Design a protein around this ligand. Structure first.
Ligand SMILES: CCCCCCCCCCCCCC(=O)OC[C@@H](COP(=O)(O)OC[C@@H](N)C(=O)O)OC(=O)CCCCC
Lengths: 245, 245, 243, 245
């Protein structure tokens, strides 16, 4: 744990997530601004967020896990895949990341296109609870795809974990956008909300629905469909980050 | 088979065939809703349906084979690929899943969006028989792609079965939406048709079209082009669930 | 020899069958549906995805040419035999006719129009069009040849999807000039089905074939040649090369 | 090095780079013309430019490395793993094919759609600095993904390096077009310019932004994240072109 956190490997892994979430938020928000020029369409926006995740999973996945999402990091914590300290620093990183990325976009978009910087937001004729359950489901399917696409034990041809995973997030947007703007990711939500100093009463849903959805997926997969056999000592070791590097 | 049906893995498989179809119908109908906000276009809808199955195939395929469609399950039966009891259970789980999927969406979509909850629906301009033959074609190429994509034997690079298969679905909507709203799957149709007690006519088309095209592709793939060498009796054994290779 | 084989007979039926479905999907996806006129990207992905799928699905039976221009190219590149090429191109053409027909008999009157036949940009001359078609079919073919080279050591990802998106790419430019053929069978099929042969039709044979053949010679002779010996190359053509 | 510059393969590679850039400029420019017949939309264009690279990468990458972009060539020079001279002819070949490809479209494009020939051009609401940061960031993610997808030491599944790389350029277009019309490639910007005699006052952006972001991605990836054991001065044998005989 002191050994874990005090790796260059770890320092790198923490940096990869910051920079990944930075780049991810830049691109995702940037693609959804109401460019007067040409106003982004549902499909355009959904493939933009997804290709962002596919591209960063591919490019930086090797360095950290390519989590780029506090809900999937907390989930992976629940599923006994990472140490407590990895989860914590990752979430920080993703949140700091999300804010810097939103930061740079604010900085470079014309007055014209800045709008409210693509903050998530309800349909208005959509209720909070609804929002809440839609987001649970959007995130649930993503996590599942994620756990399945990176399981070292998987026997069937995996294809491209990166593109399956990114296109899974475009699928999420293809419905999510109509309910909430589509969060699926507490950091994607936090970022614009900070930077701009815009927080809606519903903002909590963008934290709750994603995390609960991911964690439900983590409990289903890792402990119901494909549990492994380790000792409580080894389980403990994971959480205390002692099990191994 | 007593030992087959009662096994824990089977109980997972049936759960997964249920879980998927539900999630698939959720995203499927949900992306197809006449959102006043921005009407889904046709590429929009097709990509959402394709990436749901692709996603789902990646995620729960290693659990059940991830049929997520009666036509295909039925066709793997006929092709001597699965046991009669995995076939009945798979179909039942699918039909119920689709119902719950239409069910959660119904309760989640705003009244302005709900509409007829994306039920299939032959175009006034087209004969049933007309409809019947395109849903035949549409599920024929899906079936072929699936079998080809998921065969043990195949020596040529398969790439991504899940993404290949997913985009097979998408392709099918690019033509299919124009005649029937693209069925290619008895449960996707039966689902919404149930949550709304408004089945409509030609619905049979949505059963026999897909199932026939599926079955035809089994015939050709498994008995015409790439037959197996299973014993005359070995076949009965896969029918009963006692086969062991 | 070949022909007289259940292997070669299955192949050819594969090419017939694949072209059918390919043509059905391509054309019906390009018809003028009044509820929603098929857009350019929409159309490009229907053609692209059809080939992606058919090659994934039927590719192991035949090699999935689904294109007389490719087949001839392979011949020229010494990758297939003379009879192989004869019978396939044969099959593709009739398979395409078949596919246009099934669609013609199935599309609603208000949709049928055209029937998605290839057709020149009006402000485009046949020579202009000839070069574009050349080019469109050139990139596609070397996508094919590189993606099905057994000597390839670089990870090939998905040859099927790479090749399908290759088609898609051709449409995104090509549709604006010629409606994008890239495939004489594709253009031949609806034309037979609805008489109406264009005065530019030759473009739709010559352009795609020349461009593919150019790519065949580039890749198999200039880029990635084999050792195959004079007499052993001729056995390639006579459909008796083992090795 | 006369060792490699005089090789028949160097020859083939220098030439493929020419051929690939040519075809890539033909297609990207060609897709993005206004075309009154049907104005190309943003995603339409994002996909065209992307599938062009993913295609050409697949086709011609084993011949040359398929850089098709002076910014990524120079970055590969910066991060080591190509020689100075390979870099010179590659960048020379890219600029000539770009011009070569822009010319052939000019020759082929009908009057009412030619324009312009799809030159890059700042948003008038966009600051040259602003546009530069954006281009920096756009090529940075692309260059990062390229390096990650072509690293021989990579262990986790790479999926399709060609289609990832391809979808990465598509990603960068879905934001970049609204800003600079999306360069990410000095050669794409240079080609049409030469042919139309249009060097916008902000031309510098299309080179320096893309080349910085690239080099930056190459420094991080090669020298910080995934450093190679060797070192030392067999690095100058890299530069000199005489390494690993
Ligand atoms: C609307 C427009 C949107 C466009 C969507 C575009 C998305 C298209 C998706 C294409 C991605 C295809 C990915 C794709 O084709 O990936 C294919 C796999 C090949 O698997 P494998 O046998 O090498 O790995 C071992 C395997 N048995 C296992 O199980 O691990 O990629 C790899 O992992 C390596 C590639 C090397 C090839 C020699």
């Amino acid at each position: 744990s002191k050994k874990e956190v005090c790796s260059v490997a770890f320092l790198k892994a923490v940096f990869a997530e910051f920079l990944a979430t930075l780049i991810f938020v830049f691109f995702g928000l940037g693609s959804a601004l109401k460019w007067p020029s040409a106003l982004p369409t549902i499909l355009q926006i959904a493939l933009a967020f997804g290709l962002a995740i596919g591209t960063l999973a591919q490019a930086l996945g090797p360095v950290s896990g390519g989590h780029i999402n506090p809900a999937i990091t907390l989930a992976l914590l629940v599923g006994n895949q990472i140490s407590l300290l990895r989860a914590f620093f990752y979430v920080a990183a993703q949140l700091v990341g999300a804010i810097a990325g939103a930061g740079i976009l604010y900085g470079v978009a014309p007055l014209n296109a800045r709008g409210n910087l693509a903050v998530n937001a309800l349909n208005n004729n959509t209720t909070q609870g609804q929002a809440m359950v839609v987001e649970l489901i959007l995130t649930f399917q993503l996590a599942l795809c994620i756990f399945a696409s990176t399981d070292s034990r998987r026997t069937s041809p995996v294809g491209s974990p990166a593109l399956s995973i990114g296109l899974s997030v475009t699928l999420g947007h293809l419905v999510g956008i109509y309910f909430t703007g589509c969060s699926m990711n507490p950091a994607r939500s936090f970022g614009p909300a900070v930077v701009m100093n815009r927080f809606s009463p519903a903002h909590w849903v963008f934290w709750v629905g994603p995390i609960v959805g991911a964690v439900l997926a983590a409990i289903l997969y890792f402990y119901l469909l494909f549990p492994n056999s380790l000792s409580l000592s080894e389980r403990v070791a994971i959480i205390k980050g002692t099990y191994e590097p």
